Symmetry: C3
Subunit: 409 residues, 3 copies
């Protein structure tokens, strides 16, 4: 059987070459059916775990840690997430100034038309974290509402345990252990699903490179390069540096987190790969009281690779119109991109409405057929970028978790 680490990489390199070739020879649709369904199963199976593994592991990751200690972990990780997202958009702007994406290109106007979905009022996202029905939250996604109830129950159960009454102490344990039993069961399934990863990894990027890899060449190549080299440069300058400054090996970090990074790459789903993102943190050594809180929160808020795309997409649309953004305007993109990660938060369709308000704040509405036709070209290679963006998105989740685990013991 062997790997694990290597067998995944075989299907990733084999799938890309069998993707690019089979798709360039006309048969892109022959890859949509037949090939992709296998990759979907892998995505589904990993999603299958995302709800129980988050809920069960955080209820025990709150009995684990002191309530004041969990509040400190939260204050640090949120500060980490905001600054790392601010660096990605700053690096995205500066990468889109090294590479010119669509500098001498006048776009054909009148293609696909887009409508920007309304951003829900900031108050009603912050309030909607507190779930009216904890069962409800669980029953249908709702990652952030489930987080709130797991911690609240986890703090209550830790209180209920060390009560003087021992008839109530047995109730508090049996519940806690069973919930840990579910958690433990999920991590055990992760490994099982991970054995299927090579086939899914093969099929997923066999589809992406076939259906979208043919369109990579051209003026769209200068976009993909400015995104990828930007993603490459952020790992080596903002992660590898922050890991070193906090006394943890960068080389040993990528080795252990390679499972949670490749799945994130091929799946393009931050929460989708969250069981693997969590299992990698447990084998890293981090205590449940930290990673069962930080990683699911980071799956929603720490969109590092996305903000790096949102910098080089704002500049792509700008150059295609022939309007170059001034010194004071480049900082105003940085502001709203970070505030878009909170202005969306729990709300579904983030990566689309998040960019809608980013393009709007600098003065480039998505409703304008001039902008909409140019943004349509970006979408023609969106899954090529999404792979890289999602990989960097969860790298920062794990990098922050490890740094908060270091500022602990």
């Amino acid at each position: 059987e062997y790997p694990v680490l290597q067998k995944i990489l075989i299907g990733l390199i084999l799938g890309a070459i069998v993707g690019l070739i089979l798709g360039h020879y006309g048969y892109a649709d022959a890859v949509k059916t037949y090939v992709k369904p296998f990759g979907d199963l892998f995505v589904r199976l990993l999603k299958m775990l995302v709800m129980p593994i988050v809920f069960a592991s955080l209820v025990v990751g709150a009995a684990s840690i002191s309530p004041a200690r969990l509040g400190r972990v939260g204050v640090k990780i949120v500060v980490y997430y905001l600054l790392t997202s601010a660096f990605a958009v700053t690096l995205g702007i500066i990468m889109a100034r090294l590479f010119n994406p669509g500098a001498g290109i006048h776009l054909a106007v009148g293609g696909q038309q887009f409508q920007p979905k309304q951003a829900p009022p900031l108050v009603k996202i912050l309030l909607d974290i507190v779930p009216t029905n904890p069962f409800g939250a669980l029953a249908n996604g709702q990652v952030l509402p489930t987080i709130f109830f797991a911690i609240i129950l986890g703090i209550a159960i830790t209180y209920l345990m060390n009560s003087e009454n021992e008839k109530v102490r047995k109730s508090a344990e049996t519940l806690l252990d069973a919930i840990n039993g579910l958690a433990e069961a999920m991590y055990k399934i992760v490994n099982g699903v991970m054995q299927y990863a090579p086939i899914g990894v093969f099929a997923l990027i066999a589809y992406v490179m076939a259906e979208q890899g043919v369109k990579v060449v051209g003026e769209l190549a200068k976009v993909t390069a400015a995104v990828y080299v930007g993603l490459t440069l952020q790992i080596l300058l903002v992660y590898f540096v922050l890991l070193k400054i906090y006394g943890i090996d960068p080389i040993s970090f990528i080795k252990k987190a390679k499972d949670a990074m490749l799945t994130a790459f091929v799946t393009r789903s931050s929460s989708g790969t969250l069981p693997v993102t969590m299992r990698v943190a447990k084998e890293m050594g981090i205590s449940e009281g930290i990673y069962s809180f930080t990683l699911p929160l980071g799956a929603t808020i720490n969109m590092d690779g996305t903000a790096l795309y949102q910098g080089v997409c704002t500049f792509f649309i700008a150059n295609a119109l022939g309007s170059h953004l001034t010194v004071g305007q480049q900082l105003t993109i940085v502001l709203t991109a970070v505030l878009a990660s909170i202005g969306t938060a729990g709300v579904p369709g983030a990566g689309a409405i998040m960019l809608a308000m980013v393009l709007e704040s600098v003065g480039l509405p998505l409703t304008d057929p001039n902008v909409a036709a140019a943004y349509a070209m970006i979408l023609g290679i969106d899954a090529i970028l999404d792979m890289g963006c999602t990989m960097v998105n969860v790298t920062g989740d794990l990098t922050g978790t490890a740094i908060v685990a270091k500022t602990e013991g």
Copy 2:
């Protein structure tokens, strides 16, 4: 830190004055945002508990009590609920004959138009208590279906325990304890949410008295007086008298239930305040077998304060047209106001579709522009009335719970 009981009453009085004054100066919209956001947080936090706390505490509240003893409690609490709801509408009419709401007022017709929602066939309400999917019921509200499944599981789990097999006895106990563990954990969160109450109590009635307290003067003053003095008169005549007649202290009842009475007043939700209503019952001394059944059922059926509003609203609309109701018609309001509590039961939009069939069964349809304009004015102070009605609504819920617990031991 102190109170609890006093600190909440600080936010209540200070919120009412800062509400009435800030709203009268035009800035009712400035209270709608900023201030109210902190009131909702409190409501959502309470409602967060309502589902697990109702399910978990009723499973162990059926493990507690004998299967014939629980059905006896049922037959007693139901006969209590119907007579107190019948006393509320009888008092609502008699207060609406002492006070005259809109006796010399001809209304401006053509304002807001209303359409009454259809009341589901009685058969398909009664049958709908037996839920088809217990996880379904839990997952989305459904207080009454959850009651049925909890008692059916609680009676089975109690049968399962004292079986001759000590492999199946351990199974029954682990489940019963873990469920109790959830229940005991929820009551523990109740106390924590209760610490935030003074900020919520403040913000909720600071909003209501700002946005709706300015319109309390006028002919609408005679309605609010006939509602409130009716509510005060029902507490002192129907609750206090029934508390005395069954041998339990009236004053000490108010002292221990004031927490579940103030939250009911500011939230204006019967189920919304059910975690506090239950916690006040356990601290009172009532067995889990009774209050885990009666209080959630009372949060649905026993709408005492509401039937008292439904009494003086039927009379407000009748006076605003000039049509005075007869000696044979006043009894027909009493009938359908009570049979409206069952004709809605589980169905959402109760307090509105209930009044719809009440007004219709005396000869005043809500479709008629003449009636519709007059009801529109009543809606102008609907929250002001909702505060008082909900308070009495949960009071009757507690009062019944105590009387049945006395006819026990």
Copy 3:
């Protein structure tokens, strides 16, 4: 109190004669209200159990059995289900050639019109078995997705138990027992609901006989005869013969499965009676490892009696038009009848969309006003056919579950 087996049979016979007579004297509607509601309660009480009993007992059925053993069970019971479904459509045709349903009958055209609902692509049925949200699946029917997560959790919990750490071993046990606690409790409730069976059985076929029993005479009689004599001839030739050949007493098999046969008959719902169909398997001796997996799957795929209806329905329609089907065509009905069982699988409205695609494949589309007018007559006795078809539908579910358990220990 007595029966159980007899008191059901008292209501079944009594309900038939009181139905047929009460219906033939006009008052069919008077049976629809009044009488049916009681029979619906019975159906609802059973369906109440179907979700917990399926999940909870299957997790402790995957902990019961070896992971390879279960795969073998699956591979056998699936091959069983296919060969029995194929026999029923073969027997349907062979009974529909013995009886001539609608041979000399020309239909009046222009009546009810039918549109056939689309069959979901086979890929997105198979893939939709792996549930994205386990809580979701539970929360809203989803028998098959639940089956998959229940076996995956049961294999994970069994691995987790005999792990070399005794802090993780207690976690896996407490959960497994609590889940079993739930399973056990459900089986207990099944006994309680079964005490209400005579009232339900009586009311349910009191309705069906009154509102459809009168229309059984005429050319529609020859249809009901060819179906029922078909159903009888399939039990006495493919079950009794397939039981005998596997060393299991047929007469004693019917004795023990009678309670899960007479509920299936009056409910008309395969999943509806699954709590009884499971308890009857438990009392039969069969290991939870097998029946908690084979019976829920059988309630979905193994629709023997149905495919015996689809046999004599594809012939009633063909006879009413005058077009007679050739030797090779009769086989093409058989093929797509069996394939339709997987073509629908999880999807609701199966028994309809299944038939729709069965008719289309031989050359008689349901859209055709000729066909539609003839099929509108068959529907006139569709509950009278459904009763018998549902019986043979679960009889084949147990028969298979017995044969598989015989190929074991």
